[model samples]
Target: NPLVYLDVDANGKPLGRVVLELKADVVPKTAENFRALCTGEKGFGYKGSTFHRVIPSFMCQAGDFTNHNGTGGKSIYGSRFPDENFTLKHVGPGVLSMANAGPNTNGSQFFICTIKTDWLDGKHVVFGHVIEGMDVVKKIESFGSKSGRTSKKIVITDCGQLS
Candidate 1:
């Protein structure tokens, strides 16, 4: 398994760090894409990306490094990639799942579930979970409105492989 950390901030204030443990055992191909993107070893990554959309008690949306918004992002494989598999379920909070337009449309965009998202099960691929910093995720969640837009910019100040 690969451990990655995302140092997040809202506006100019430091929100804290979010550590994620990728389930390579269940989703190696999907996990490795996130791992390599975090390290930026491929010449592009999530380091300055912003959590473009967020919904309270829902999910913190982000990973669109190219546009920094929901409309555009590219995967390590290409502009888009097929869903690896959907073995993991959206069982609880902090579950990391790919956000796609439809089937096999995963790109660099993903969302962290802030609550149990049972309806998302078998629809989105759950590749990891938040190992730490749910509080930070909550702080980000607080800024979100009913429109799923944050009051302030939620930026990933830094990110990389922790192990």
Candidate 2:
């Protein structure tokens, strides 16, 4: 397991922070892929990534730093990764799941369940849970955005494992 620190800010001011506990054992390759993306070991990190898609009472999607949109992103492995560890349903808030267009199309993009979404259970890979900062997650959910894009840069800021 690994803990990822995400500092969610507004206009360079700290708005909130979240801690995600990755379920490596549940989804080894998927979790490792995210870890690589977070550390930039694969040459591109989530440090400057924005929460490109924010929907209240639903989720906030991001990690597409390559194009800063929903369509442009790649895994640290250079392409896509198959679905894994999807048994854990997106049953409640703080649940972290991979975002994809269709089946078996996971990349750097992911979404956090700001509200319970059990319907998304088998559709995405749940590789982590918010160990802390559900309130921050809430902040991101309620945040005002023009077109799913935030006013201030909602960057990941800092991300790494908690050993």
- The best candidate by TM-score is 1
**Which residue ranges in model 1 land beyond 4 Å of their true spot?**
none
Local distance difference test values of all predictions, in order: 0.90, 0.81
lDDT of 2: 0.81
Q: What's the distance in Å from true for residue 81, model 2?
A: 1.3
What's model 1's TM-score? Answer: 0.97
Cα lDDT of model 1 by residue, 37-150, tens digit: 899999988999899999987898999887776888888886678888989999888999998989989888999999999998888999999999999998999999889878
* lDDT minimum window of 10 residues, candidate 2: 144-153
Q: How far is candidate 1 from the true structure (C-alpha RMSD, Å)?
A: 0.9
Across 1-163, the per-residue lDDT of candidate 2 in tens digits comes to 8777787776677877788888887888888888777777666778878888997778889888888989978887667878875778888888888999899899999999877888888889988889889888777777745467665567777776666
User: Model 2 off-target regions past 4 Å?
Assistant: 144-147
Q: Report the number of backbone clashes for model 2.
A: 0
> Any residue pairs clashing in model 2, and if so which?
none
lDDT of model 2 at position 79: 78
My TM-score estimates for the predictions, one after another, are 0.97, 0.92
